[PDB]
């Protein structure tokens, strides 16, 4: 059984919510949870890893993510 990695999601206001995900988890789930907790529609936000857009069906494995990596959230363009 694989382990959770813990990712830090940084908001435009520098707030942080951390999420534990497995390496094969689709990141849509993280995006939806984050948007829910911010009180905004998921499609109003864009989520970036090292500046690149995170797709709904990206996984941490596909993105090469590791423990304590950062996701930045910006308003959708």
């Amino acid at each position: 059984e694989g382990e959770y990695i813990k990712l830090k999601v940084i908001g435009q206001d520098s707030s942080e919510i951390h999420f534990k995900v497995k390496m094969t988890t689709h990141l849509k789930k993280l995006k939806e949870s984050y948007a829910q907790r911010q009180g905004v529609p998921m499609n109003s936000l864009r989520f970036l890893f090292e500046g690149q857009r995170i797709a709904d069906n990206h996984t941490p494995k596909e993105l090469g993510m590791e423990e304590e990596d950062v996701i930045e959230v910006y308003q959708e363009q």
């Binding site: 534990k20 988890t25 789930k29 907790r37």
Partner: peptide, 16 residues
Amino acid sequence: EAEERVVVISNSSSRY
């Protein structure tokens, strides 16, 4: 000071 927030991201019985 914000506190730490960690969120974990993890039918025949139906009746409707």
